[PDB]
Design a protein around this ligand. Structure first.
Ligand SMILES: Cc1cc2nc3c(=O)[nH]c(=O)nc-3n(C[C@H](O)[C@H](O)[C@H](O)COP(=O)(O)O)c2cc1C
Ligand SMILES: Cc1cc2nc3c(=O)[nH]c(=O)nc-3n(C[C@H](O)[C@H](O)[C@H](O)COP(=O)(O)O)c2cc1C
Ligand SMILES: O=C(O)c1[nH]c(=O)[nH]c(=O)c1F
Ligand SMILES: O=C(O)c1[nH]c(=O)[nH]c(=O)c1F
Lengths: 313, 313
């Protein structure tokens, strides 16, 4: 069996890709993600100018997942745009470029320059409205008026299809309001659920200390901690945005976890923590494992089960 | 070495208690919690009238924690008020009564009647502003104006010290606004962080189905999934409400987990999912394991290390 999508006017070998931020900051990283067996890749969220990010240590991993307060360390938008315009081999797989300006004006400045390169090369924008780790800059999509202003200004400056990286929500009223805001914007063609679960705190019992330096230890959680939260958000936006695509991210370590994301409604499945820990070999194991679960169940296509999670009664 | 605490004008043999909702709905449950080695107990959140709750199955547990959408099944306020007034043995340990009216008016009606029993017997109110499982009733403490109204009306009607069971937050701005609202109310003497992490979705891969029946499978998460979220909220409100107590709840399975809660600022430590799974024998184990950690570190009392989590740099 082989794993075939035609999403967003592109073709993908399989639904897997890295999650933004993981294995995608430098040219070396992007060449490594391009050489891997993933179906696509996305760049590190960038800002207009290069950033060194927050002080180290700023990432730690544990058996149940990871915590991070990277603080958008990146080579600057000029680098990621050059990689998309001049360096990426689009014959290998599609590229998404993630942007995370610290203001609506900074996002609008980057998308105005991205648009010609999207027209010429077909790079796909993922607009990050959910960074939880820049001091004093709360997650934009937890302020629904700020979210609306960002999506209005980016849709008018960019003028092309794009997607949005969403924070997790935990309240049904918030799922209803956030999806209604998204559905105001016909240029939003995909919704990535979820970014890290913000502002958790890991403490080491032996040393009686937090494990990361920024923000007194507070950072975003990924990995096994967050799978049922990620699944809920994937499904909630798949139910409420029937004319958009949902990309799943959060807690994928196995082909079975990917199967659950796709059953909840995911079109692509992004891999963060587990890719950071295992490296890019993970993508051959996740495709093998997903194909094996499909064969055991008699599924021949992703479409046969995407979004077909069953409810009781 | 000593687990004793003296707070809120009561003495507690040790910091452990059930989390509201677990092993506390019937008279039998409350007698069992009283017979256990816990330092205190809290009753199931109640409403004015008895409720049957949401349809079954409505709780499921797994190796990394639990999901529930119980729907406030309870024997009604009259029952829990009579247990507090006539049945509980206060010589064995202190009792908290949790109330979760579905409107401000319902809460006010109950606290008007509780006040004379609190004055006479010393039962302590825990006001639940965070139930994530009654369809159409979003968590009250995710609407800061609703939270201030409830606290104003309950403070005026009740007139006595009480505490609040808070939802988890994921955003530094929310920690700052929530604690500022609580700090407007001098009768709020303790803050219990956290209730379940709302509206997660567990899916069984084999059956391709959600595992609980209410709300299309969406329910609150407890257990191993939520410990770093619980520790962040305990510490965030510990640091922001220096004139109140913080009670920790979320992810406690071991004495080490309780140690981390207490390092983060917890006074009492409540146990939900792991007490639902293990039963009330867990309190002797958590006590032994916390005293073992204290012995190895040279700590003789809880106040030698409560709130003393170290940050880097
Ligand atoms: C080291 C690290 C850096 C990340 N940087 C970004 C980022 O630049 N942009 C972004 O949208 N999400 C970023 N995230 C969040 C991930 O894309 C993903 O949403 C989150 O880690 C959850 O997926 P997981 O459970 O597979 O880790 C980052 C996560 C990690 C661990
Ligand atoms: C079956 C069940 C019933 C619960 N009922 C209540 C409740 O009545 N009131 C409440 O404040 N929290 C309720 N909770 C939340 C728990 O008190 C606790 O905040 C949550 O389970 C996190 O703690 P844990 O990680 O130890 O499970 C309930 C949780 C469970 C699992
Ligand atoms: O750079 C980071 O800190 C980072 N980490 C995350 O978990 N999400 C982001 O959106 C992000 F930009
Ligand atoms: O009864 C419930 O569903 C319930 N479950 C919870 O996890 N928290 C509550 O506050 C609650 F009332």
């Amino acid at each position: 069996m082989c794993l075939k999508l035609n999403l967003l006017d592109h073709v993908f070998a399989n639904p897997f890709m890295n999650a933004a931020g993981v294995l995608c900051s430098t040219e070396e990283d992007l060449r490594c993600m391009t050489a891997s067996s993933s179906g696509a890749l996305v760049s590190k969220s960038c800002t207009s100018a290069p950033r060194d990010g927050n002080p180290e240590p700023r990432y730690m991993a544990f058996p149940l997942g990871s915590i991070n307060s990277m603080g958008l360390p990146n080579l600057g938008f000029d680098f990621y745009l050059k990689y998309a315009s001049d360096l990426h081999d689009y014959s290998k797989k599609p590229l998404f470029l993630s942007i995370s300006g610290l203001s609506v004006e900074e996002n609008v400045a980057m998308v105005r320059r991205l648009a010609p390169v999207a027209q010429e090369k077909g790079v796909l924008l993922e607009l990050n409205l959910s960074c939880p780790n820049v001091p004093g800059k709360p997650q934009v999509a937890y302020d629904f008026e700020a979210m609306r202003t960002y999506l209005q200004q980016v849709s008018l400056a960019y003028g092309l299809p794009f997607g949005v990286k969403m924070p997790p929500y935990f309240d049904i009223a918030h799922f209803d309001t956030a999806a209604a805001v998204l559905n105001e914007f016909p240029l939003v063609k995909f919704v990535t659920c979820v970014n890290s679960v913000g502002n958790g705190l890991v403490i080491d019992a032996e040393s009686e200390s937090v494990v990361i330096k920024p923000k007194q230890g507070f950072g975003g959680l990924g990995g096994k901690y967050i799978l049922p939260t990620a699944l809920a958000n994937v499904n909630a936006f798949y139910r409420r945005c029937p004319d958009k695509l949902v990309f799943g991210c959060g807690g994928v370590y196995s082909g079975e976890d990917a199967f659950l994301h796709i059953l909840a409604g995911a079109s692509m499945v992004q891999v963060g923590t587990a890719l950071q820990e295992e490296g890019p070999g993970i993508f051959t194991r996740l495709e093998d494992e997903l194909l094996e679960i499909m064969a055991r169940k008699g599924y021949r296509t992703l479409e046969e089960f995407r979004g077909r999670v069953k409810t009781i009664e």
